[PDB]
Scaffold this motif. Structure first.
Motif: not given
Ligand SMILES: [Mn+2]
Ligand SMILES: O=P([O-])([O-])OC[C@H](O)CO
Length: 424
Positions: A35-39, A81-84, A257-260
């Motif tokens: 489960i990916h939590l955006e930002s 690339g953020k999420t990628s 979390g994917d990134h800040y």
């Molecule tokens: Mn993202």
């Protein structure tokens, strides 16, 4: 070029660790839900705004009393690339590129990815579900090279106006519909749900908000409070749905979390929100993005190991009971006693248990005070960080897996993968 591959393979050997016998193979052929939590940044955990917990469900999971093991010192290692980038690292134990997006630029490279390994060794079928269209971040191409079997993109959800905000599908409908899709899947599966609503500029319709904004005056920080709460509620309901569907107890479930979400541009408002000046060292600390993992038959808890997203792939493989000696990976198993407790960041900064290295200066983690006497292991660690980033980039830039006849990996034929348009 084969010699270039050999150099990287040899370089990755020294760090290899043995599985923890407590954890080795305990999840063999069990469903894995990711489960990916955006930002999502863990400064949110236990944070209240106007007396209200922003993320009450994740707060419960982070206590260690809810079947999940929480890692409070866990860092994304992404770049442009953020999420990628996060996806790339999570499924390959490689870094993204120093500039640009590995997904966009190296989408037809040869890979020996986690989903492909799970398929080959244990018959896992893999999927990604996401409420945006498949060619964003070149996912359509990249996933074929990773060996992902199914991609339920936006065409699998009702994308009418009432169901969308900002970039696309709202997380609550997304998780509801996704749980329904997962319930229809054959076991064992490896399923990755990528969220969307907690994304810059962090806008949420008033009708959907259940918490008021903070009052810093910075629209980004103030909006983040609302979208983070919304995501927390979406996740809480998703876990309920898993329990109702019989997909909870016997699944490995990981959350990350994917990134800040909040850059240094927002230092003024973040000082107001957090009650502390956001120095470079403090910002580095705020790059904690979290990892939570539930493993069937294992209790939850809190594990303080400093770690990064590169560590997830070897962790999952060891949980499944798969020998990883022949896989080219930069991370090490989180549960292994020998886990390498050094976390390279894409810009050459890094963190360890004791100290962080930020823009050419060393700070003690205790107090973020400057260290003027070089730690004993600094030159060793700094060298590892620089060489990890260079060796990883060499794999991508030279497309080095082309030359790897791996005894434990059958070359993926990307043309055997196709993601059909969904019913919606
Ligand atoms: Mn993202
Ligand atoms: O990479 P970002 O901008 O964080 O997230 C974007 C998306 O995942 C789009 O589908």
């Amino acid at each position: 070029s084969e010699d270039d591959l050999t150099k990287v393979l040899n370089y990755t050997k020294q760090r290899q660790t043995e599985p923890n016998p407590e954890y080795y193979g305990v999840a063999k052929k069990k469903n894995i839900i990711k489960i990916h939590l955006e930002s999502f940044q863990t400064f949110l955990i236990n944070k209240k705004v106007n007396g209200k917990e922003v993320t009450p469900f994740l707060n419960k999971l982070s206590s260690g009393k809810e079947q999940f093991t929480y890692f409070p010192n866990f860092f994304h290692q992404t770049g442009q690339g953020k999420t990628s980038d996060s996806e790339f690292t999570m499924d390959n134990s490689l870094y993204g590129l120093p500039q640009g997006s590995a997904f966009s630029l190296k989408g037809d490279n040869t890979y020996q990815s986690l989903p492909a390994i799970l398929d080959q060794k244990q018959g896992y079928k893999s999927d990604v579900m996401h409420g945006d269209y498949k060619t964003f971040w070149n996912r359509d191409q990249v996933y074929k090279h990773f060996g992902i079997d199914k991609f339920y993109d936006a065409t699998y959800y009702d994308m009418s106006d009432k169901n969308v905000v900002n970039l696309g599908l709202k997380d609550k409908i997304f998780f509801k519909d996704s749980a329904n899709y997962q319930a229809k899947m054959k076991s064992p599966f490896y399923s990755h749900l990528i969220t969307l609503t907690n994304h810059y500029p962090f806008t949420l319709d008033e009708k959907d908000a259940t918490i008021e904004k903070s009052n810093t005056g910075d629209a980004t920080v103030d909006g983040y409070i609302q979208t983070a709460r919304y995501l927390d509620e979406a996740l809480e309901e998703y876990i309920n749905d898993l329990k109702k569907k019989g997909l909870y107890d016997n699944s490995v479930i990981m959350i990350y979390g994917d990134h800040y979400g909040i850059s240094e541009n927002h230092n003024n408002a973040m000082e107001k929100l957090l009650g502390e000046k956001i120095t470079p060292a403090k910002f580095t600390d705020l790059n904690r993005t979290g990892f939570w993992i539930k493993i069937p038959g294992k209790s939850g808890g809190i594990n303080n190991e400093y770690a990064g997203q590169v560590d997830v792939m070897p962790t999952i493989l060891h949980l499944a009971g798969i020998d990883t000696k022949n896989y080219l990976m930069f991370g090490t198993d989180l549960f292994s006693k020998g886990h390498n407790q050094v976390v390279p960041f894409r810009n050459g900064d890094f963190i360890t248990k004791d100290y962080k290295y930020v823009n050419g200066k060393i700070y003690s983690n205790k107090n973020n005070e400057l260290i003027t006497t070089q730690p004993a292991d600094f030159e060793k660690n700094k060298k590892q960080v620089e060489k990890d980033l260079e060796m990883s980039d060499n794999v991508l830039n030279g497309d080095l897996f082309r030359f790897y006849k791996n005894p434990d990996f059958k070359k993926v034929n990307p043309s055997k993968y196709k993601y059909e348009t969904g019913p919606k």
